[PDB]
Symmetry: C5
Subunit: 334 residues, 5 copies
C-alpha cells in the first residue's frame, strides 16, 4: 500500500501534451479519467501528473497502465536515490530536481519519476514547478525535432532538460563559492561561518544525487530495449557525458570548500594576534610609566628628588626615554 | 554455550501459529510445549525472549537440528549482523537500537532469527522489540501475511526491524539540525559534549548498517528455501531500504564531521570580539590615566600646575587624544 | 639465524601429547627428548619458549624439515602476521599483546606456529602466553579437543589467541572512556600526551589486526591438510571474530581521532571565559581609576575639589557608569 | 539548446587563423590563410600535414572541416565544448583527442586553461585551439629545421610529437608550482599576515584544478599505448609509452604536492598560535610585575591622615626596596615561562 | 633538443669510474677503469659479471654501452632521467629496473636520493649510478670472500643479491626516522619553539617522498616474483619473494609513521592553546584583584574636600582591611579556575 512520504500537499494538476508530426494538442485537467485513454494513442503523449500526494490518482493511473504496485510505492516515496528499473512493459526512472534559493542559501529537491510506456511518458511531480519548459516549447513550436520522433526521444528530451538544469545550479553554486571565499579572507561577515557550513551541506546532498544520476544514464546508454538504438542512444550518450562533466565539477567544489573554515581560522588567528600586539605595546609602555608617575605622587616625607627644580623634567625625560627604547624594541613585532 | 550479554531478568516464549483461516497464540515459560510446532503445516513464529537461559537455547537448537556453532553465535551478542545459509535453515543475526534521549546514547539488543521448514525462531535478549506491527497484522489478518508462508514471515520481521532504523535516523537528523544551530551561538561545554556524543553514535550506527546491508544483499540473490516465486521482490524492497539508510548515515557522518570546526571558528571569532573591546578600552584609558598620573606627581616646581588655563587644557588634550583613538579604530570597530 | 628480539632470560619446552583417552605432559630443557614426537600418531603440542636459543630452533627446524628461510623468519620477531603454506607444513606468524594501564603502553611477543602431520610447533619469545584455556581443555578433557586431530589443535590455539584481542579491546575501550572524559569534563596535566599515546597504540594495534585478518582468510578458503570435513567451519568462526575485531579498532581510531579536536574546542571555550572576565573587569575599573586619577591631579584652579557636593557626585557618577556597564553585560555575562 | 547543434561554449572570440605545415623528408611548406577552402585539399596529401585551426568560436569553419574529413557531428559538438575532461575516442578512420594547455598567471596566482582538440586522420593531424598561444613551437622548429626524425615519419608520429610537447609543458608548470610551495612553506613560519593565507588557499585551489585534468590525461595516453589501430605499432608505440610514463610521473608529483600543501595552514595555525602565545607572555610579565607595584605606590599616594609609614623615614627607601624585591621574585618565578 | 636524444637530468657531475666484478665459483676478476672499451667484452662471459658504471652524467659512456649490449635507446633515455618512479620493464634480451637509494642527514633533517638503474642481460648485470657511494658493499664482500652461495649462482641471483642489499638499506633508514619521530613527539609535548613546527612539517614531507618511492618499489618486486621469464624459477624466485615480503613490511612501517606523524601538529596546537590559556589565567587573576584595589587607592588619593573618611582615624586601616578582604574574596572565587 501507498503512502506519500513527501511534504508537498497543496498542488494538483495534470498536463497532457499529445503531439504528432503535424499538429500538437495540450490541456490541463484535474480529472484523471480524461487522460487515461491516451494509453493507446498512436502518437506520443506526455502525461504530467503534478501532486502525487493524491495517491488515489497514482493508484488509478498505475493500475490502468499496468505498473507493478511496488513501483507505485517507490514513486510515492520521495526519499530515495535516483535509479532505473527496466520491465517488460515500461522503463521506470527516478530523478531529482533541485532549487537553490539564494538569499537564505538552501536547496530543496523535488522528486520526479518517469515511466516510459508504449507511446507515453508518465511524469510524476510533487509540486507545481519544473525544469521542462524548454521541452514544452519545442513541442509547441518545433525548433529541431521532437515532433518527428517517438516517445523514447520524448524521454531523452525530458532527461536532457533536467540534467541541463544541474549546470545552471552549479553556476549558482560556483558564484556562491567565489563570494564565500572572499568573505573568509578579506571582507568577513556575521554569517560567514554559517554559510560555509551550509555550502558544505548542500554540496553533500548534491553529490549524493549526482553519482547515482550518472548510473541511470549509464544504464540508458548501453542495453536499451524499447529505446530505438537506431536513433535515440547517441542522444542519451550526450546526456551521460554531461552527467560526468557535472560529477567532476561537484568533486571540485567539495574539495575546494573543505578548506574554507581552515582559511577562516587562520584569518581570525591573525586578526586576534594583531589585536593582542596592540594591547601589549600599549600596556607595556604605559604601565611602567604610570608606575613611575605613581611613585612621585606618593605622599612620603623623605623624598629628596621632589625638591629639585630639575626633578620634574628629569622624570619626564626618563619616562620618555623608556618609551622610546620600547618602541625601538618593537622592531620585532609592530 | 555461554551468554555474553547483560540481560538476565526476563524469560518468556510467545508462539503465534497462524493460517489463512485461524491463528493461535500463547505465552509459556515451558519450552517443551513449543517444540511440536517444528512439524506444523502452517507457519509458526516462535519467539524466545531471554537467551540468558542457555538451557532453553540448547534444547531448542537440538530439537530443530541447529549446528552447535550457530547456537554459540546466537548466545554471543557482541557481534556484527550476519547471514549463514544451511541445508535446512537460514540463520540471521540483527540488532535493534534504542536512542536514549538524556544520555544521547544508543543501546543495542541483539535479535537472532532462524528460518526453518515452516517456522521462524526468534531469539531476543530481553522483553522489548520492534515487531508489534507484525503481530498486529497477524492478529487482525491484515495485508497478506496470513496467506503466506514462513519465508514471508521472515521478510515481515526483517522489514519491521529495518523500518525501525528510519525512525532512529529521524531522531538523529533532528538532533543535527538543533546542534548545527547551537554551534554558532554562545560557547558552552554542553554543545561540545553533544557534538562529540553525536559523532560517537553515528560511528556505532555506521558499524552496524553496513553489515545489515550485506545480510539483505544475501537474502536478495541466492535464496534457496525462499520462494523466488513471490518473496524475493519483497526482500528487495528491504534491501533497497538498507541502502537508503546507509546513504543517510554517510551523509550525517559527513556533515557532523565539520561541526567542531564550525564551533572553533565561531568561538574564536567571539573571543576575538571580546579582545577587541578590552583593547580599545585599554588603549584609550591607559595613556589618559598616565597623563592624569603625571599631574599629581608631588613634584616641586611643576609650572603647569599653577597656570589656570591648565586644568582645562589637559581635559582638552585628554579628550582629543581619545577622539583620535576612536578615529584610528577605523579598521576594527 | 639470528634472533632479533629482546628476550633472553627464559628457556623451557612443554610437550602435550594427547589422544582420545591418555594425555601426557612434561617440561624438559633437553631438545632431544621432544624430537621423537615428530612421528606420533596422535596429536602433539610442542611449545618452545625462548627462541633466543637459536641452536634449538635450528635443531628442531632441521629434524622436522622446515626450509631454513622459514627458520630465519621465526627468529625475526619484527614482522607482520603471515601465513605460508608448504607441501607438508603450514607456517603461521602471530602476535600476543599486553596492555599495561598506569604507564599506558603495550608490548607484543611474537608466536610462530607450524602445523606438521600430527604436531603443532609453537615458538615463543618468553614465558607468558594466552593459551592456558587450551591446556585446561586438554588436561581435563573438555569440549572435544581430545577427540580431534592436530589441525583442530591449531584452530584451538589460534582461537585462544584471537579471543585475547577482545580482552585487550575492552581495556582500550576503558581507556577511551576515561580519556574522553578528561577532555570534556575535568581535564588533567597529561591528557594531550595520553591522547597522542592512545592514537599511537591504536596504530600499532591496527597494523597487526589487518594482517591477522588475512591469515585467517587464508585458513578459511583454500586449506589443504586441514580436514575440510570438520575444521573449516571453526576457522570461519575465528575469521569472523577477526573481522569483528578489525571493525572495533577502526571504530576506536575513528573515535579517538576526534579527541584533540574536542579538547581544542573545550580550551577555546575556557579561554573565551577567561577573556570575558578580564574584559568586564578592565572595562569597568580602567575608566573609574581614570576619573579618580583626574581628581588626584595636583592642579590649581580645580573648582570641583572645593565644591564639596563634588566628592559625592563623583562617587555617584563612578557608580552609575559602573552600573550601566554591568547592564550592558547582559549580553556576555 | 536542442541537442544536435554546434555552439562554442568557450570565452575566446577575437582570434582566427589557420596554419598548415605540410612536410616530407625533402621539403616542407607552410602558410597562414583565413580561407578554410585552401586547406581542405591536404586531406589526401601523401605526406603528413599539420592543419592547425586557431579560433573555434568560428563554428562554421569547424563544421566545414568536420564534414570534409568525415567527422561524426557529435565529435564536432565535443570539440566546440571546451568545458570537458581530457579524453580519447577511436573511430574507424580517425582518432579524436581532447587535451588542455595550462597558463600560470603569477600576480593573480591563478591558472587558466585553453582546450586543444586533435584529430588524427590518414596523413593529417587536425588541431583545434581556442586562441592564439600554444605549447607546440618546439614541434614547429623540428619540422622547419628538420631536426630529430619528424620529417622522416608519418602523421601518427606528428601526433606523438604534439602530445609529447604538450605533456612536457606540464613539467614546466609543476616546476613553477614546486617553487611556490618552497617559498610558501617558508613564509608560513614568518610573520602572520593575510597575504600568506591568501596564497596558501590559492595554491590549494590550483592544485585541485590541476589534479582534475592530469588523472584523465593519464587515461588518454594509457589508451594510445595499448590497442593502437592506425598507429604503426612497429615504430610509434614505444614513443607514446615514453609520454604515458611522463604522465604518471606527473600525476605522482601532483598527488605529492596536494599531500604536502594540505598541511600548510595547519603549520600556519601552529605558528601564529605560538607567536600569539609569545605576545601574551610579554603582556602578562609586564602586567604582573607593575600592577601590584602601582598598587603599592597607589596606597602611599592616598591622602589619609594618620599614615604612620609616611613619616618614619627609612620608609620611602623601604618601599622602593620591597617594590624591587617583589619585582625580582617575579622575574625569578618566570623561569617557568620566559 | 628533440625528445629522442640523451641528456642527464641529475645534478651529480663530478665522479666517473667503472668497476667490474666477473666471478665464477673459483676465479673473480675485479678492476676499476675509466676506459669504457675495456669492459665491453665481458658481455660474452660464460660466468656472471657485475659491471658498475658510476657517473652517468657521462652520457657518451651510457650510449656506447647501451649500443654494444643492445638496449633500445628509449631505455637509455630513462636511465639518464633520474627524476622518475621505481619501475620494471621486461624485454626480449634484458630486464630493465630503476631504483632509488636514500640518505638521511640528521642535523639538517633532509634526505637525498641517488638513482640506480639495473639491466640484467645474458650473464651480466649492468649498474648505473649517479655518484660514487652505494649500499652494495655487502654483495661485493660476499663475492670477494666467496660467502653464502653467490659464487655458485648465475647473474639473476646477482640481481636478487643487489636488490636485496638495497632494500635492506631502507630498514636502516626507517630506524633513523623512527628515532626522529621519537625525538619530535617529545619536543611537541613540552615546548613552544619555532623549529619544532618546522621539523614536524619537514618530517611529513620526507615521509611523503619516502612513501611515494616505496609503493612503486613494492610493485617492481611484485613483478619479479610472479611472471619471471628467464629468472630461473627453479631457484631464484623464492629469494625474490623474501625481498617482496620485505618491501611490504617496509611499506607498512611508513604508513605507520605517516599515520603517527599526522597527529603531531594537532598535539602541538592543543599544547600551545592550553599553554596560552594558562598565561591568560594569570594575567586575569592579577588584573582582576589589583585593578579594583588600585581604584580604591585611587579614590583616596583624590584631592577633594570635604572627604570625611580621610580624617576618621580608622579610615586608612579600614580600607587596607577592605582592600585585603576584597582580594581574599577574589582568590576564593578562583577555585573554579585553578
Ligand atoms: Mg597625591
Ligand atoms: Mg516495505
Ligand atoms: Mg583540523
Ligand atoms: Mg562505551
Ligand atoms: Mg543540449
Ligand atoms: Mg621529450
Amino acid at each position: 500500500t501507498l503512502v506519500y512520504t513527501g511534504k508537498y500537499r497543496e498542488d494538483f494538476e495534470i498536463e497532457v501534451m499529445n503531439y504528432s508530426i503535424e499538429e500538437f494538442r495540450e490541456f490541463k485537467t484535474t480529472d484523471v479519467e480524461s487522460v487515461l485513454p491516451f494509453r493507446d494513442s498512436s502518437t506520443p503523449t506526455w502525461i504530467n501528473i503534478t501532486g502525487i500526494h493524491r495517491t488515489d490518482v497514482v493508484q488509478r493511473v498505475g493500475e490502468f497502465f499496468g505498473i507493478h504496485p511496488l513501483v507505485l510505492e517507490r514513486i510515492l516515496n520521495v526519499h530515495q536515490r535516483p535509479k532505473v528499473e527496466f520491465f517488460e512493459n515500461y522503463v521506470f526512472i527516478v530523478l531529482k530536481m533541485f532549487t537553490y534559493d539564494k538569499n537564505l542559501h538552501e536547496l530543496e529537491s523535488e522528486q520526479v519519476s518517469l515511466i516510459l510506456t508504449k507511446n507515453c511518458v508518465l511524469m510524476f511531480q510533487e509540486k507545481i514547478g519544473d525544469v521542462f519548459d524548454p521541452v514544452r516549447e519545442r513541442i509547441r513550436y518545433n525548433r529541431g525535432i521532437i515532433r518527428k520522433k517517438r516517445a523514447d526521444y520524448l524521454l531523452y528530451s525530458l532527461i536532457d532538460a533536467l540534467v541541463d538544469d544541474y549546470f545552471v545550479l552549479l553556476e549558482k553554486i560556483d558564484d556562491e563559492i567565489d563570494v564565500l571565499e572572499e568573505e573568509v579572507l578579506e571582507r568577513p561577515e556575521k554569517e560567514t561561518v554559517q554559510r560555509t557550513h551550509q555550502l558544505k551541506r548542500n554540496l553533500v546532498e548534491l553529490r549524493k544525487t549526482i553519482w547515482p544520476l550518472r548510473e541511470v544514464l549509464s544504464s540508458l546508454y548501453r542495453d536499451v530495449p524499447p529505446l530505438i538504438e537506431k536513433e535515440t542512444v547517441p542522444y542519451f550518450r550526450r546526456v551521460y557525458d554531461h552527467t560526468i562533466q557535472i560529477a567532476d565539477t561537484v568533486e571540485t567544489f567539495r574539495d575546494i570548500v573543505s578548506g574554507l573554515l581552515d582559511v577562516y581560522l587562520s584569518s581570525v588567528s591573525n586578526k586576534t594576534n594583531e589585536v593582542m600586539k596592540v594591547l601589549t605595546i600599549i600596556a607595556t609602555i604605559f604601565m611602567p610609566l604610570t608606575f613611575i608617575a605613581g611613585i612621585y605622587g606618593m605622599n612620603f616625607e623623605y623624598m629628596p628628588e621632589l625638591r629639585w627644580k630639575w626633578g620634574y623634567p628629569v622624570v619626564l625625560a626618563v619616562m620618555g626615554v623608556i618609551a622610546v627604547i620600547m618602541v625601538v624594541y618593537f622592531k620585532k613585532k609592530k
